[PDB]
Design a protein around this ligand. Structure first.
Ligand SMILES: Cc1cc2nc3c(=O)[nH]c(=O)nc-3n(C[C@H](O)[C@H](O)[C@H](O)COP(=O)(O)OP(=O)(O)OC[C@H]3O[C@@H](n4cnc5c(N)ncnc54)[C@H](O)[C@@H]3O)c2cc1C
Ligand SMILES: Cc1cc2nc3c(=O)[nH]c(=O)nc-3n(C[C@H](O)[C@H](O)[C@H](O)COP(=O)(O)OP(=O)(O)OC[C@H]3O[C@@H](n4cnc5c(N)ncnc54)[C@H](O)[C@@H]3O)c2cc1C
Ligand SMILES: Cc1ccc(CNC(=O)Cc2cccs2)cc1
Ligand SMILES: Cc1ccc(CNC(=O)Cc2cccs2)cc1
Lengths: 588, 588
C-alpha cells in the first residue's frame, strides 16, 4: 500500500523533503538546506509511478497536497513559504535539531555492519552514535575500531595468506629465469606481523576520521540495552551513564569459542591472538576444521611451520564435501599433517612463553581417537578454531523483550527488525544469515536507507558467493552437489566438470590435474545453474562475476554461448562438456 | 522450415543415424557401429519438438517413416535388419567409406580454429584432412603445429608476462618478511626461453597425437584452393599433387606486417622471432602501439631491458581511450619510454648479430615527429608491431570466386559460408570478427556440428570480452565510453567509476589510486550495462564471469543486488556509486 509506506516513512525519517525535480520551489528549499548545512533525505515524486497518490496521502499530515513538504521526526514542518521564513528569522536550525531522544540512531558495535549503517544513516540527517568496545582475550590481546574483519579476520588473514603464496612465487621464479635460490631463503615472522599491524593501525585511524567527517559521535564504551530506547554505557574510566535513542541497531558480532577442557583457556590461543603474535608459533597444532582452521594451518605451513590439524569428524562442514576433500588433499601434499577423527582432552604446560626474547613455550596435548586409541604429542603453540558465538547476555537485558534463538542469535524478520519494533540486528548475530563482511555491510547500508530515506529495497541473502583462502583457494556460489540432489532428486541433477592447469604452472613444473571446477545444474528447469565450484589460484576473482549471472538465473546455455578470455583459468567455465553421469574422466 | 533443415542435414552429413532414445532397434544399430569403430552423428527424434514432422519428411529420402534410419553421404543405407546384413556379410565397412571425394572435409590451416574444426568434424565420421605449413620469417624462424597462439602468440606472450610479474613478486616478498634482496637478483633470458619453448614443444606434439587418435590425416604441406573441391598441396620435398574434398574450411590466419622503409626486413624483427630468440634483445625499440606492441615492451622492461615505444598517433586504437592512457601512464612510471607522434624512416646496421658470443647486433634508427623534428638513436633490437595481414593470394586462386573485402579478408555470412557454397572461413581471416583464439575455436567447433551433425546453433560474436596483458592488466567487455556516447548521446549515458587498491599492495607499499574500474550504462534502458572496464591485477580472471551476465542483459541493479566476495579486487564492481556527471572524485 502507498499509504502504509508513506505513514512509515514519515514516522521514521529524521529530516525528509518531499519534492519534484522540475519544481523551482523545491529547488529553492534544497538550496536553503544546503547552505544551512542541514542534511536530509529527498523523495522525488515525479520519478515514482504512484507520486500523485502520495501527494493525496501527504495531506493526512499537512492538509496540503502541493510540493515541497518538509518533515522532521514525524511532524510536518512547512511548505516553501514556512521553511524560508524560519530560515530568515534564524529559527530553522532549532526546529531541525529538536528531538525527544539524544540520538535518532544508536549503533551498538563498531565493526563491518555497524560502521556502515552509522555512516549511511548520518547522510540523511539522522543524529547518530556508534559505540565500540573490545573485551580483551584471556592473554590480554585487544585492538582498535573496525571490528573482526579489520583487526583479527579477513584483512590480516589474507595478508598472511599472501606471504604464504609468495613462498611458491619465489620457487616458480627460478624456473622462469630469475637468479635466486629458494633453498637459501627464509621467512621472518616478526617482520610480517609488524607490517600487517601497521596497515591495521592505518585502518583504525581512518574509521575514526570517517566518523568525524560524517558528524557521527564515536564512543569507545561498552553498551547495554536496558529498555527499548535506553542504552547504558560504561566508560574507559568505568563511569556509567545512560543515553537514549529512537532507533537501535545491534551489531556486536561474535568471538571465538574454547572447548571445555583443562588448560585450553590458560595455554591455548585463538585467531584473536594469532594475527598480532610477536613470536612465530613454531610447531603448531590447530584444533578444528572450519575455514578459519584450514586457512591458518595453510599459511603457517607455507611460512616454515610444522603444522598438524586435529579433525573431530569432517573438513569444512556445510561446504560441498567433494570440494572440501580436494582442498585437504592439496594441503596434505604441501606439508600439513592431519589427525583425523580425533578430539583433545587436556592441555598441559611444559614451558612458559618467553615474552622477553619472543619465543613460544611448550605444551603437551593429550586426546583420543574414535576407536579409543590415545593421542599425545608436544607442540609449541595450540590454536583453537572450534566455532564462534555471540555473547548477547552482556549486550541485552532480558527484560527488553528481544527474542533469541537456541544458539543465542537474534530472531529477525526480513527487514532486520527484532521482536521490539524500534530495535534491529545486523551482521553475524542475525540468526540464519551468512556470516560474511559484505553481507553485514549491505544489510547495514540498506537498513539505514529504509529507516531514514524511505527506501523499500531489502537485502537478498540467497546465493551469496564465498571463497576459502586455503593454499589452493576454493570459490563457490550456490548449492553444493549433495544439497542439490537432496532438494531435487538425482534424476533431475546434471553435473558438468573438468580439471585444469594454470598456464603459470607449466614452466614452473606444478601439478597437472589438481585444479578442478564444476557446475551443478537442474535438468527440468532449462539446465539452470544451481551451484558453481572452483579450486584454483585467484578463486575469489574467478567466482565473483559469475555470482551476478547466477542471481540473474543463468543456465548452462548462457555459459556455453559466452566466449572465453584466453589465457585464463576462468575461461574453462565457458567450454565445460563432460558430465558425471557419462563416466568420462575430467582430466586435461 | 523442418523440411529445409532435414534436406540440408541429409545432404551434408558424412554418417548419420535417426533414432529414438527408447527404441531397442536403434540401440542395436548403435552397438553395431560402436563395435565396428564407425563414428557417426545421431539425431534423437523423441527429444525434439518437431520430431514427429521430421519422421514424416524422412520418407522423401528413404520411403519409410520408422526409426532407426542410417544415411551415408546423402544416401539412405538401411533400417536395422539391413545394417545387420551388411555387417554380417563384411560389407558395412566398404559402404561407410564410399565417397566421391578424397575427404569429407579439408581444413587449410592448423591453428586455433582449424584444429578445433577438424577434430570436431571427425567425431561425427567425417573423413578429415588438416593441412599446416609455417613459412619461415626473413631471418629463418619456423615452428611446429598449432598456429599463432600456441607458438608465437598468447601462450609464450603470457608466460613471458608472468616472468615479468615475478620481478614485482620478488620485491613484494621482502615486505612480507622473506629474506631475499631483489637488488642482488638478475634475470637470465635464455633460461626463460628454454622453459617456454619446452612447453610449446609439448603442445606441438600433443596436437599431432590428438589428430592421430581422432583418425584425422595431418599433412605438413602448403595448400592452395584451385577450384571449389580441389586443393593443390606442396610437401617438404616440393612434390606437388591434388586432393579433393566435399567441404573446405579456410583457416590460414595472418602474419606480421613490416613498414616499407630501408632496412626493416633485413635488420628488424617481429613477434614471430621474439619468442624463440637465443639472446636477450638488450636496448630495444618497439615500433607500434597495438596490444602486441605494449605487451612485449612491458615484459621486456620488467626483465631488465632499456625499452622505448615509438607511437605514430594513439595507444590501443579501437579500445577505450581513457583506459588506454591509464595503461600507458603505468608503463611510463615503471620503466618504459615513449616517443610520441613519431614514425621511422630507415634502419641502418652498425653491428651484425653476434652468433659467436650469443649477443644482438646494433642498429641506427632514423625517423621524424609529426612537426618535422628528427629522431635518431641507436638500439640493439628493433621490433615491428605495426599490424597483421592475411596473404590469401597465396591460399586462394582468384578464379574460385571467393569474395574478399578491401583489406583482403574473407566476406562471410553469419554461418561462416563464403560466396562459394561448399567453402567456409573461420578465425582471423573472417572479415569483421574479433581476432581472438576462443572466437576461432567456438566458430570452428560450431561450424563442424552444423555441417556434420545437423546442428543449427550459430556463433555469437557480440560483446566478446578481451584482456590486454600489459604490466598492469586491462580487461574489458562491451562498448567503450566514447562508442556508447556516439551511439546513444551523452544525455542517455551514465558512467559509474571508482579507483581501488589491491590488499596485496598495502604491505608492499605500492600505489594507492592507480587501479580503476567503470561501468558504462544506458539510462533509458533500465540502466543496462553497455560496457565494463577494469585496470588491475588478474584482470582476465576478474572480467570473465561478468561476460556471462552482460550476455544475459545485466543492468546496474543486477550488480547492486549481488553481494561481494571479500577481500578481492573484483568485489568493487558490486558497490559502485560515484557517477562521472556528479564530478565527485573516484579516489578511495
Ligand atoms: C579469522 C576470520 C577470518 C574471516 N575471513 C573472512 C573473509 O575472508 N571474508 C568474509 O567475508 N568474512 C570473513 N570473516 C567474517 C567477518 O569477520 C565477519 O562476518 C564480520 O566481521 C562480521 O561483522 P559484524 O559487524 O557482524 O561484527 P564485528 O565485525 O565482529 O563487529 C562487532 C563489534 O562490536 C564490538 N562489541 C561487542 N560487544 C559490544 C558492546 N557491548 N558494546 C560495544 N561494542 C561491542 C566487538 O568487540 C566488535 O568490535 C572472517 C572471520 C574470522 C574470525
Ligand atoms: C603476439 C600475439 C599475441 C596474442 N595474444 C592473444 C591473447 O592473449 N588472447 C587471444 O585470444 N588471442 C591472442 N592473439 C590472437 C590469436 O593468436 C589469434 O586470434 C589466433 O591464433 C587466430 O587463429 P587462426 O586459427 O585464425 O589462425 P592461426 O592460429 O594463425 O593458424 C593459421 C595456420 O595456418 C598456416 N597456414 C597459412 N597459410 C597456409 C597454407 N597455404 N597452407 C597451410 N597452412 C597454412 C599458418 O602458418 C598457421 O599455422 C595473439 C596474437 C599475437 C600475434
Ligand atoms: C542560495 C540561497 C538560497 C536561499 C536563500 C534565502 N532566501 C532567498 O534567497 C529568498 C528567495 C525566495 C524566492 C526566491 S529568492 C539565500 C541563498
Ligand atoms: C551389445 C552388442 C554389440 C555389438 C553387436 C554386433 N552385432 C552382432 O553381434 C549381431 C547380432 C547379435 C544378436 C543379434 S544380431 C551386437 C550387440
Amino acid at each position: 500500500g502507498t499509504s502504509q509506506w508513506l505513514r512509515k516513512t514519515v514516522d521514521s525519517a529524521a529530516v525528509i523533503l518531499f519534492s519534484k525535480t522540475t519544481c523551482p520551489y523545491c529547488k529553492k528549499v534544497k538550496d536553503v538546506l544546503a547552505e544551512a548545512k542541514i542534511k536530509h533525505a529527498t523523495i522525488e515524486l515525479d520519478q515514482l509511478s504512484n507520486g500523485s497518490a502520495i501527494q493525496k496521502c501527504l495531506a493526512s499530515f499537512s492538509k496540503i497536497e502541493t510540493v515541497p513538504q518538509m518533515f522532521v521526526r514525524g511532524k510536518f514542518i512547512g511548505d516553501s513559504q514556512t521553511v524560508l521564513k524560519y530560515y530568515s528569522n534564524d529559527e530553522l536550525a532549532g526546529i531541525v535539531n529538536e528531538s525527544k531522544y539524544d540520538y535518532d540512531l544508536i549503533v551498538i558495535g563498531g565493526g563491518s555492519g555497524g560502521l556502515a549503517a552509522g555512516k549511511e544513516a548520518a547522510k540523511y540527517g539522522a543524529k547518530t552514535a556508534v559505540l565500540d568496545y573490545v573485551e580483551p582475550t584471556p592473554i590480554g590481546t585487544t585492538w582498535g575500531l573496525g571490528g573482526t574483519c579489520v583487526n583479527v579476520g579477513c584483512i590480516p588473514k589474507k595478508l598472511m595468506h599472501q606471504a604464504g603464496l609468495l613462498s611458491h612465487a619465489l620457487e616458480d621464479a627460478e624456473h622462469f629465469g630469475w637468479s635466486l635460490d629458494r633453498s637459501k631463503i627464509s621467512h621472518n615472522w616478526s617482520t610480517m606481523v609488524e607490517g600487517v599491524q601497521s596497515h591495521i593501525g592505518s585502518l583504525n585511524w581512518g574509521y575514526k576520521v570517517a566518523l568525524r567527517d560524517n558528524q557521527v559521535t564515536y564512543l569507545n564504551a561498552k553498551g547495554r540495552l536496558i529498555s527499548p530506547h535506553e542504552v547504558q554505557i560504561t566508560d574507559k574510566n568505568q563511569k556509567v551513564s545512560t543515553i537514549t535513542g529512537n532507533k537501535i541497531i545491534l551489531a556486536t558480532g561474535e568471538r571465538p569459542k574454547y572447548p571445555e577442557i583443562p588448560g585450553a583457556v590458560e595455554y591455548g590461543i585463538t585467531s584473536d591472538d594469532l594475527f598480532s603474535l610477536p613470536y612465530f608459533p613454531g610447531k603448531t597444532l590447530v584444533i578444528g576444521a572450519s575455514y578459519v582452521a584450514l586457512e591458518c594451518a595453510g599459511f603457517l605451513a607455507s611460512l616454515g611451520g610444522d603444522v598438524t590439524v586435529m579433525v573431530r569428524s569432517i573438513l569444512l562442514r556445510g561446504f560441498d564435501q567433494q570440494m572440501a576433500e580436494k582442498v585437504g588433499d592439496y594441503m596434505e601434499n604441501h606439508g600439513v599433517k592431519f589427525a583425523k577423527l580425533c578430539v583433545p582432552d587436556e592441555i598441559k604446560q611444559l614451558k612458559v612463553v618467553d615474552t622477553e626474547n619472543n619465543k613460544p613455550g611448550l605444551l603437551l596435548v593429550k586426546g583420543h581417537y574414535t576407536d579409543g586409541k590415545k593421542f599425545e604429542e608436544e607442540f609449541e603453540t595450540v590454536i583453537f578454531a572450534v566455532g564462534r558465538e555471540p555473547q548477547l547476555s552482556k549486550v541485552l537485558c532480558e527484560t527488553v523483550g528481544v527474542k533469541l534463538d537456541k544458539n543465542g542469535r537474534v530472531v529477525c524478520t526480513d527487514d532486520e527488525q527484532t521482536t521490539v519494533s524500534n530495535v534491529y540486528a545486523i551482521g553475524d548475530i542475525n540468526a540464519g544469515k551468512p556470516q560474511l563482511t559484505p553481507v553485514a555491510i549491505q544489510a547495514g547500508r540498506y537498513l539505514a536507507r529504509r529507516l531514514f530515506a524511505g527506501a523499500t529495497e531489502l537485502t537478498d541473502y540467497s546465493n551469496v558467493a564465498t571463497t576459502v583462502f586455503t593454499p589452493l583457494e576454493y570459490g563457490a556460489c550456490g548449492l553444493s552437489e549433495e544439497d542439490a540432489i537432496e532438494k531435487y532428486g538425482d534424476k533431475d541433477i546434471e553435473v558438468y566438470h573438468s580439471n585444469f592447469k594454470p598456464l603459470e604452472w607449466t614452466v614452473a613444473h606444478r601439478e597437472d590435474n589438481v585444479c578442478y571446477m564444476k557446475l551443478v545444474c537442474r535438468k527440468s528447469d532449462n539446465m539452470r545453474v544451481l551451484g558453481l565450484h572452483v579450486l584454483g589460484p585467484n578463486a575469489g576473482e574467478i567466482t565473483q562475476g559469475y555470482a551476478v549471472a547466477i542471481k540473474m538465473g543463468a543456465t548452462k546455455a548462457d555459459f556455453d554461448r559466452t566466449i572465453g578470455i584466453h589465457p585464463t583459468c576462468s575461461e574453462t567455465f565457458t567450454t565445460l562438456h563432460v558430465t558425471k553421469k557419462s563416466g568420462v574422466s575430467p582430466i586435461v
